[PDB]
Structures are given as structure tokens and as C-alpha cells.
Amino acid sequence: GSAPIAKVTGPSTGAVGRNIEFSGKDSKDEDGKIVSYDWDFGDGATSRGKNSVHAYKKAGTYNVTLKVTDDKGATATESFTIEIKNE
């Protein structure tokens, strides 16, 4: 179709205060190039980029959302749930 499809790659679990790496690299678009990746880590922090990093300050479950936008302004979103624990 003409819409990009967003995919979030990351770890299902992680540690308080450690950098967690996420990626949007599996996102695809058959009708354009993906030009931007916008991240919301679910604790109020945001970032951008094909890859992103965040350290959570408190243990808990968090919903991470990625929005991809392509070269014709078309967008797609996807979510990823991570459990962060005290190690």
C-alpha cells in the first residue's frame, strides 16, 4: 500500500538506570523512503532517529511508541512494551 509500516525492535526487559537501545530499522515503505523516526519512551521522554537510547529512572512497565514519516508525509506508528526492573 501507500503507507509506511512502523516496527520497533528492542529488549523485552531492562535495568533501572541503564541505557536501553531501540531501533526502527525493520520499518518499511513500498511507496517512498522513510525520512524520520520519532520516539516516545512512555515516561515522558522523547527522542528521534533510526536508533534511539533511553535510560529509565524508575522500575516499571513502559510503552514505547515509534512514529515513522516518509518523503511524501505519510506516517505510521507502532508500540513496544518493556519491563524495567531494579538489578
Author numbering: 685 to 771
From the paper:
The collagenases consist of a collagenase module (s1), a variable number of polycystic kidney disease-like (PKD-like) domains (s2a and s2b in ColH and s2 in ColG) and a variable number of collagen-binding domains (s3 in ColH and s3a and s3b in ColG). The X-ray crystal structures of Ca2+-bound holo s2a (space group C2), Ca2+-free apo s2a (space group P61), Ca2+-bound holo s2b (space group P21) and two new forms of N-terminally truncated wild-type apo s2 (space groups P21 and P212121) are reported for the first time. Comparison of crystal structures of ColG s2 with crystal structures of ColH s2a and s2b suggests that despite common tertiary folds, PKD-like domains can be grouped into two subsets.
Each structure begins at residue 685, although the first two residues (Gly-Ser) are remnants from GST-tag cleavage. The last residue is either 770 or 771. Conversely, the PKD-like domain of collagenases consisting of multiple CBDs, such as s2, appears to have no surface aromatic residues. In contrast, the subset containing s2 is likely to be different; the lack of surface aromatic residues on s2 suggests that the domain is less directly involved in interactions with collagen. In this context, the spring-like dynamics of s2 may allow it to swell the fibril.
